[PDB]
Write a protein that binds this ligand. Sequence first.
Ligand SMILES: CN(C)c1ccc(CNn2cnnc2)cc1
Ligand SMILES: [Mg+2]
Length: 460
Amino acid sequence: QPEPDMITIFIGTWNMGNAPPPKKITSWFLSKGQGKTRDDSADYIPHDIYVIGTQEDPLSEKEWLEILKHSLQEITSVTFKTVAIHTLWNIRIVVLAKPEHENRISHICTDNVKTGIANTLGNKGAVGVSFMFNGTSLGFVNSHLTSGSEKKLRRNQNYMNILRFLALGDKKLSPFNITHRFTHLFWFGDLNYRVDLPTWEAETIIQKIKQQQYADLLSHDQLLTERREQKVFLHFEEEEITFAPTYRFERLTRDKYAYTKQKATGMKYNLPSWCDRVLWKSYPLVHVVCQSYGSTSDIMTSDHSPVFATFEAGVTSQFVSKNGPGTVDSQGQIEFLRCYATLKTKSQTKFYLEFHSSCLESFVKSQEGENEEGSEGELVVKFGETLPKLKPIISDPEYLLDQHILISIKSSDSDESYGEGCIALRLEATETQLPIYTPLTHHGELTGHFQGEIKLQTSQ
Ligand SMILES: CN(C)c1ccc(CNn2cnnc2)cc1
Ligand SMILES: [Mg+2]
C-alpha cells in the first residue's frame, strides 16, 4: 500500500451560540451551501483528516464526538478515529482521521491560550492541535477572538498572544512560534472581524446581501483591511469569500439578519459580518490548494452559520536510507553564499544565525556576522562565505529537495531571536548558485529580510 504524496483536509468553524446542533449537520462536512462548494460527485469520498473548531459550544466532548463520528459515518460509511480533542471553556477543536492513517500520525500535541487580563480573561482564546503525518508537520488553531465592531485592535492583540504562546509542534524549534513550526498551519475560528460601515447603512447592507453583491461589503471587512495593512495574519492566505456574511442571524431561519442593538448585545449593533474564517500558511513551494470555502444554508440553531474549507495538501514519506536517520550522508551538503540579513532593529549587538531543519541531526549555529549601516538607516548583517556547510542526514534528491531550512537571527548579547524565516530546498537546479530569500518576522511582525545564494549538493 503506497504512502500518499497528497491528502485532503476538511476545516470547519462554527460558533454554535450555546445551543445544541440540529439532528442533521452533514451539509457542513459535504461543503454544501453558499460560496465555493464541493462537487456532488465527491460526496462519498472521505477527506483524510477532518478538523472541527467550535465556539460557544454547549456540548460535552463525548456528546460532540458522537455527533461528529455519526455524521461522517452516514456520509462516507467510514468510522473515523479520534486523533485529538481539546477544549478551553466553550472553545473546542476535534481532529478525526481515516483509520488507515492511524500509524501515519504521531507526535500529537494540544494546547490552549487564554487572551486578555482580568475583565477580558475568562472566555476568549484559542485551542490547537499539531501532529506529524509521515514526514509532514500539520498545525491547527481554533480561536475565538474579542467581539464587537470597535475592537479590531484587541482582536489583533489576541492574534499576537495566541501565536506567541500556543505551544505546539517540535519544542526543539525554540526560536520559532507556530507560524514557522509546520509544513501546513491552518488558523480558523470566530475571528470576530466585522464589516466596518455606518450603523445607519444596516438595511442597505442587507439589500446588498440579498442581491449576492459582496464587493462593497468585503472592501470594508476588517480582517481583509487589517491584513492588507500588515496588522495581523502576516504571510497567511485566505480563499476569496463568495458566501454571505455568516453573522448575525435570527435563529431557526437564515432569512433574517439580527443586527439592532439589544440589552443582550450590550447595546451594540451587529451589522452582518464575516466573523467565521479559515486561513492558512504553508512552507514555500509546498502544494496547498483550497478546493472549497463556504457556509451552510440549512444549519440554523445558532446566530452564526457554519463555515467549511477543504484543502489538497502535499505530504512527504518517512524517509529511511542506508545512512540517515542516525548518521550524515556525506554525498549531501547545503552551502550559503553572500548571505546578509537586513534588520529593522535600532540595537547594535552582534548577531549569529541558527539553521533548524528535520534534514539535520541537530540545529547549526553560525559565527557572528559583520554589522554595516544601510543607506536608508537599516542594520545589514553580512555573513559572506563564513556560514557553516550544512550536512543533511539523507542525500537522496527525492527527499532533500522537499525539505526546508528555518533561519533565526539571534543577538550574541541576549541569545534572543530578532527574526525567523524559512527557505525551501525545492531548487531549480543542484550544484548551482541560486538566489534565496525569506522575510524575517518576530512575534509574527516583520523585523527584516534574509537573502543570498544557496548551492545544494544531492546524490544525483
Ligand atoms: C460507495 N460508498 C462507499 C458509499 C455509498 C453510499 C454512501 C451513502 N450512504 N451510506 C452511508 N453508509 N453507508 C452508505 C456512502 C458511501
Ligand atoms: Mg455569540
